[PDB]
A paper describes a structure:
Antimicrobial resistance in [name] is partly mediated by chromosomal class C β-lactamases, the Acinetobacter-derived cephalosporinases (ADCs). Cephalosporin resistance in carbapenem-resistant [name] (CRAb) is largely mediated by Acinetobacter-derived cephalosporinases (ADCs), class C β-lactamases present in all Acinetobacter spp.. Interestingly, a common alanine duplication (Adup) is found in this region. We previously demonstrated that several [name] variants with an alanine duplication (Adup) in the Ω-loop gained the ability to hydrolyze both CAZ and FDC.
The X-ray crystallographic structure of [name]-33 in complex with CAZ was determined to 1.57 Å resolution. [name]-33 crystallizes with two monomers in the asymmetric unit. In the A monomer, contiguous electron density to Ser64 was not observed, suggesting either a pre-covalent Michaelis-Menten or post-covalent product complex was captured. The product of CAZ (A1BIM) was added as an alternate conformation to the acyl-CAZ in the B monomer. Electron density for the R1 dimethylcarboxylate group of both acylated and product forms of CAZ was not observed. In the [name]-33/product complex, electron density for the R1 side chain dimethylcarboxylate group is not observed, due to its presumed clash with Tyr221. Overall, loop flexibility, displacement of the deacylating water, and destabilization of the acyl-enzyme intermediate appear to favor hydrolysis of CAZ and product release in [name]-33.
Numbering used by the authors: 1 to 211, 216 to 359
Amino acid sequence: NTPKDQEIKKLVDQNFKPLLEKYDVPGMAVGVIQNNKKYEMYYGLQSVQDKKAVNSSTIFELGSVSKLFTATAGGYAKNKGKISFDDTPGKYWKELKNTPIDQVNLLQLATYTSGNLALQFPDEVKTDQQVLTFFKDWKPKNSIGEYRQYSNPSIGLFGKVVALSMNKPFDQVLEKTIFPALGLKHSYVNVPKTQMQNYAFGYNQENQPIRPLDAAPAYGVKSTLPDMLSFIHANLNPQKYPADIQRAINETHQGRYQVNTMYQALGWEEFSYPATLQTLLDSNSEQIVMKPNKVTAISKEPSVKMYHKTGSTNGFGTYVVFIPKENIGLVMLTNKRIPNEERIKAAYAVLNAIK
């Protein structure tokens, strides 16, 4: 008939390639992993002016997909006994002791239920001093633990606490501990000089090339398609890893509460599988992403589940999704933002069509 690598290439061509013309995207990397086999598709240019093709070495910004690595770092520290998720941040950032934010526990920060943390840090919050002062000045609003409000500050504080508990700067926790444990050799918080030639330009909505530190746990990671597929492989096969990181990965798969059809895990969003397309689109709706929503306890603990996460920066888009019981996952990286719904729909059509 037709070899499987060609079949998957055709499906990615049918569902992802048209997005390049439709949204004027310079470069894209799409990868599928199925039964521990990797399929990689590279399109377009990492740098338009340099005529450098997207390839297996191309480095992209992950945006909020970076939180998946922060979540994994948190599970690692927890299962190593460096933190408990019932701890409060002042136990580790002592300057926050005796402040309102010291009533919020680590799980609540990691899953956005402090009750009064906005999507972004204020533009004027730049230094670690202004970050500290931002959190000491924080005051509650809604009951802590009651409302989900997607928040970069919230998981940014989580990651700072994780770094403090491991006695290392957060960038070192990832580059010296978590990335090596996961077998990722081309993933970075800070892209070294020797790799700038592989660092894609991001492109804004005029197709112009473009490119605080405590915000790095929320959106500071860069990576390649091979590394992101290895990361998806790790999430599909935690048992293939040492106990410390195996337990860390599993920690990130544990649903913590629900908002309608969405289960909030650590970093990952989780869904009963099979999931309808609308369930997946709802997780990225304005209601869920931009507004507070009352959370509810998990009632149906789904036996068969899937996970995904979108992420964006000014010049980059990312989508990652995996389905443990089908042993399948997909990564999309672009050096131009495209609508999140397009990423989800295209991935849903590929994954459902794959034999």
